[PDB]
Design a protein around this ligand. Structure first.
Ligand SMILES: [Zn+2]
Length: 26
């Protein structure tokens, strides 16, 4: 899955979790 945190370089299998991840960078 091409879903990686542009903000810290961590990626996720789930698009939801990646957005959840980056939501914590908001
Ligand atoms: Zn991140």
């Amino acid at each position: 899955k091409p879903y990686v945190c542009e903000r810290c370089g961590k990626r996720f299998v789930q698009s939801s979790q990646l957005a959840n991840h980056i939501r914590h960078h908001d």
